[PDB]
Amino acid sequence: GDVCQDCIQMVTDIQTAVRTNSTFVQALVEHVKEECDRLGPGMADICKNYISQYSEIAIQMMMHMQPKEICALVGFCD
Amino acid sequence: MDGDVCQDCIQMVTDIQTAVRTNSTFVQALVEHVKEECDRLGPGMADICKNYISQYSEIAIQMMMHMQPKEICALVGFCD
């Protein structure tokens, strides 16, 4: 309800940033990859690859789907 | 509505923490989604990832339930 609406708003604004802020995605992926170090040697670099892979598909499914559908995917809507 | 990603994240995390207290199964779909994208790592790693997430998801959920939404959003990169 409010959670579905809040999810839809967040997705909407992320789509807007991705489409109008050429620095947004890179800065976000780079920041998350840095947090991956928290996992320590071995696991950290896997986490980094994971983030690299997830961002590609997230930007892809988000550049192709509507926010409500993206939110339903993770159980925040419907 | 054209909003702010950082504020959206703070509100969103605030709602999730509220929904989890009401019903601890609320983030199930999200966890399954994270585990499923493990396949993007290709053969081999996909298995290391799925097992890792499967091992610490409960602990991760517990940690985040004790963290402040802004702290969580700062961690993930939507705020600051």
The domain limits of chain A are: 1-78
Tally of CA atoms within 13 A in the half-sphere of B68 that contains its CB? 4
| Cα–Cα distance, B20 to B73 (Å, whole number) | 17
- For domain B1-80, the question of CATH label 1.10.225.10 is answered with yes
Classify burial at A76, counting beta carbons within 10 Å of its beta carbon; exposed 0-12, middle 13-18, buried 19 or more: buried
With CA atoms as reference, the chain B residue closest to A1 would be B15
All residues of chain B having their beta carbon less than 8 Å from the beta carbon of residue A56 are 40
Dihedral, A49, B54, B9, A71 alpha carbons, nearest 10 = 100
Q: DSSP characters for chain B?
A: ----HHHHHHHHHHHHHHHHHH-TTTTHHHHHHHHHGGGGG-TTHHHHHHHHHHHHHHHHHHHHTTS-HHHHHHHHTS--
Total number of residues shown for chain B: 80
CATH topology of domain A1-78: NK-Lysin (1.10.225)
Q: How was this structure determined?
A: X-ray
Q: Is A31 on the interface with B (CB under 8 A)?
A: yes
Q: What is the resolution of this structure in A?
A: 2.2
Cβ–Cβ gap A3/B12 under 8 Å = yes
| Cα–Cα distance, B5 to B65 (Å, whole number) | 21
